[PDB]
Amino acid sequence: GDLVKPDAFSVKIQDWGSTEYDVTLNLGGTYDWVVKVKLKDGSAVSSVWSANKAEEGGYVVFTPVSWNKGPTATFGFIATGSEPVEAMYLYVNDQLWDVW
């Protein structure tokens, strides 16, 4: 269907051998958000800030720590390798809000 909030993601990346992803979520509200990340094979998330991490269905799944639910939430992570993230998906209440 149509993205619920196509202007939610604001992402900045730095690649120095491993790649840093600075993720800002312009949510407009406080939510138990979920960001699913598609990584290239062979890469791993080696650092995480302001989010909890899990793995589900082959994707890395980031969820907020208690104080980072919005309306503006920002978290980050470093993944090994050069630009290993192929896509990120923002879900709020089981609906796809935005895609990076």
Side-chain angles (χ1 to χ4, degrees), residues 42-77:
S43 175
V45 171
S46 58
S47 291
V48 185
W49 291 286
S50 302
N52 292 131
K53 178 176 63 66
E55 304 192 315
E56 293 172 34
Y59 290 78
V60 176
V61 182
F62 290 106
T63 49
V65 286
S66 65
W67 47 268
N68 198 23
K69 301 184 182 191
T72 302
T74 66
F75 70 101
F77 64 92

Side-chain angles (χ1 to χ4, degrees), residues 14-85:
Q14 295 192 284
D15 174 8
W16 63 70
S18 278
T19 307
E20 167 195 316
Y21 293 81
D22 186 308
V23 183
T24 290
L25 305 176
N26 293 118
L27 303 170
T30 301
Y31 307 106
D32 290 307
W33 55 259
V34 174
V35 170
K36 301 191 68 170
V37 177
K38 185 182 184 189
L39 283 183
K40 291 188 177 303
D41 284 340
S43 175
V45 171
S46 58
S47 291
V48 185
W49 291 286
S50 302
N52 292 131
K53 178 176 63 66
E55 304 192 315
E56 293 172 34
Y59 290 78
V60 176
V61 182
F62 290 106
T63 49
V65 286
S66 65
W67 47 268
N68 198 23
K69 301 184 182 191
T72 302
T74 66
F75 70 101
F77 64 92
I78 295 176
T80 60
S82 178
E83 295 184 51
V85 175

Side-chain angles (χ1 to χ4, degrees), residues 1-7 89-90 95-100:
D2 308 297
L3 289 174
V4 176
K5 195 173 189 302
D7 69 348
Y89 306 77
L90 171 69
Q95 293 181 155
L96 180 65
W97 277 33
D98 200 8
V99 176
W100 182 78

